[PDB]
Design a protein around this ligand. Structure first.
Ligand SMILES: Cc1cc2cc3c(O)c(O)cc(O)c3cc2c(=O)o1
Length: 158
């Protein structure tokens, strides 16, 4: 409670592949299904600034914003925040990964609060974020597992 989402998925693929594919942001439009577009606007050394544009929501509204993220492959963590807070007081996003017996776990956590005069409340935003997160996590899992299986078939059959 409240303005907090915490979602995870296990992907039956090795850490290197899961990390590389999920952090290849210019290819996000082909991996995720929720974005109309992803544009990388800048990179300092470590920090990547990019614009996301979602497909229309349930009200037909298009959400588009700029975020900055730092992905650190040594700790297998990513931290992101919104460059302009807009309707939010703030939005902080952390992605963590680990190895388990079943493959690579990826966990996505978001912590935020809406501004007093935002067009939607924390509950609406929380519900949307859980719904989209759960769907996208499931889809990314299927695509990466498919990529892993195809790589393995190629390797074993060669
Ligand atoms: C309708 C909708 C809007 C939306 C806006 C976001 C945002 O502005 C961020 O900065 C970060 C996010 O994760 C966001 C997620 C969603 C979402 O799932 O569904």
């Amino acid at each position: 409670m409240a303005g907090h989402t915490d979602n995870e998925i296990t992907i039956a693929a090795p850490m290197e592949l899961v990390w590389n594919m999920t952090n290849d942001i210019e290819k996000w439009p082909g991996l995720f299904s929720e974005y109309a577009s992803v544009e990388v606007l800048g990179r300092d050394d470590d920090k990547v600034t990019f614009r996301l544009t979602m497909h229309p929501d349930a009200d037909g509204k298009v959400w588009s914003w700029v975020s900055e993220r730092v992905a650190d492959p040594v700790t297998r963590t990513v931290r992101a925040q919104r460059v302009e807070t807009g309707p939010f007081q703030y939005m902080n996003i952390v992605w963590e990964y680990a190895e388990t017996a079943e493959g690579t776990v990826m966990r996505w956590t978001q912590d935020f609060a809406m501004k007093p005069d935002a067009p939607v409340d924390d509950a609406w935003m929380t519900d949307n974020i859980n719904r989209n997160s759960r769907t996208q996590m499931a889809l990314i899992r299927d695509r990466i597992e498919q990529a892993a299986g195809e790589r393995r078939t190629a390797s074993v059959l060669a």
